Amino acid sequence: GHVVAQVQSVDGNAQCCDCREPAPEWASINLGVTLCIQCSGIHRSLGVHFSKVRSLTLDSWEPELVKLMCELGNVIINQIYEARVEAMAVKKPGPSCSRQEKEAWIHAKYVEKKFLTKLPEIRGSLHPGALLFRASGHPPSLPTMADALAHGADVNWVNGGQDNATPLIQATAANSLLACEFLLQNGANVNQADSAGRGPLHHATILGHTGLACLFLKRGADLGARDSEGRDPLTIAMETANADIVTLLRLAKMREAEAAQGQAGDETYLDIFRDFSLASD
Ligand SMILES: [Zn+2]
């Protein structure tokens, strides 16, 4: 039971993010926090837009998402979402508080955004989107990205008149598995292209980042998307003499012809090949 031990072991993650209940076994994977049984239940009623609930012990976890949880966690997220509690003189619910008290708090905290600072801060500003963009880039600041997202930064922010890049494309150029995963968990469009028609998969291929290319493929990046030059990701991989991304893309296309006919997709596949390569990712 390595994942629950590992995620709990992050300082401050051994109590519920919302009521401090000890040894929480649930988590929100877009927020990056651990939660008790009661508060996880309340998170489900918010909607996937606000919170995606998973069990630390009962559900499977991809390694990169485990790493992401360890780079965020309760203390970091509460610095953002509970920033003004002390100055507002309000009472965070304790473990034995009622369901309704915790419902009220959680809703105030994550939906109403009652306890937020007015502007986001650089935790490692009038423009949350732009901050998100900048914090996603090399070197990425995950706490600052979370602060920007909390203050309404659009995950798919476009850097207008200025390449039209997105936080995801910026995280790709950073070769950051962690920032990409954070953005993807918070609704980034895996296929959104810059103004030259280059999506995240195009960028991962151009930059020779195998792991990122593999991640984008696993999240439904479109294999056949052509950029302004008419290049699809396979053309770029070939032109750049990159044997590993060639074979990923080529296997992705097979997996699709098997998903189209149905049904033989099963034991990714794309993963065991990504490991053998460790190529830029
Ligand atoms: Zn709780």
Curated annotation (Swiss-Prot):
Result of altering residue 125 to A = No effect on interaction with ITGB1
Q: Which GO terms describe its molecular function?
A: GTPase activator activity; zinc ion binding
Which tissues carry this protein?
Highest level in lung and spleen. Low level in heart, kidney, liver and pancreas.
In which compartments does the protein localize?
Recycling endosome membrane
What range of the intact protein is shown?
405 to 725 of 740
Q: Does the keyword 4Fe-4S apply?
A: no
Keyword Oxidoreductase among record annotations: no
Q: Which organism is it from?
A: Homo sapiens
Describe the location of the Arf-GAP domain by residue ranges.
Answer: 1-123
The record makes one more remark, namely: Cells overexpressing ACAP1 show an accumulation of ITGB1 in recycling endosomes and inhibition of stimulation-dependent cell migration. Cells with reduced levels of ACAP1 or AKT1 and AKT2 show inhibition of stimulation-dependent cell migration. Cells overexpressing ACAP1 and PIP5K1C show formation of tubular structures derived from endosomal membranes.
Q: What does this protein do?
A: GTPase-activating protein (GAP) for ADP ribosylation factor 6 (ARF6) required for clathrin-dependent export of proteins from recycling endosomes to trans-Golgi network and cell surface. Required for regulated export of ITGB1 from recycling endosomes to the cell surface and ITGB1-dependent cell migration.
In the UniProt record, what gene is named as encoding this protein? Answer: ACAP1
Q: How is the subunit organization of this protein annotated in UniProt? A: Banana-shaped homodimer laterally assembling into tetramers, the tetramers further pack helically onto the membrane. Interacts with GTP-bound ARF6. Interacts with third cytoplasmic loop of SLC2A4/GLUT4. Interacts with CLTC. Interacts with GULP1. Forms a complex with GDP-bound ARF6 and GULP1. Interacts with ITGB1; required for ITGB1 recycling.
Q: What is known of its domains?
A: PH domain binds phospholipids including phosphatidic acid, phosphatidylinositol 3-phosphate, phosphatidylinositol 3,5-bisphosphate (PIP2) and phosphatidylinositol 3,4,5-trisphosphate (PIP3). May mediate ACAP1-binding to PIP2 or PIP3 containing membranes. Only one PH domain of one ACAP1 dimer inserts into the membrane, while the other PH domain acts primaryly to interact with adjacent ACAP1 dimers. The BAR domain mediates homodimerization, it can neither bind membrane nor impart curvature, but instead requires the neighboring PH domain to achieve these functions.
Zinc finger (C4-type) in chain: 16-39
Tell me which UniProt keywords the record has, alphabetically. ANK repeat, Endosome, GTPase activation, Membrane, Metal-binding, Nitration, Phosphoprotein, Protein transport, Repeat, Transport, Zinc, Zinc-finger
Q: Spell out the protein name for this chain.
A: Arf-GAP with coiled-coil, ANK repeat and PH domain-containing protein 1
Look up what happens after changing residue 44 to Q.
Answer: Loss of GAP activity. No effect on GULP1 binding or association with endosomal tubules when coexpressed with PIP5K1C
Residues found modified as 3'-nitrotyrosine:
81
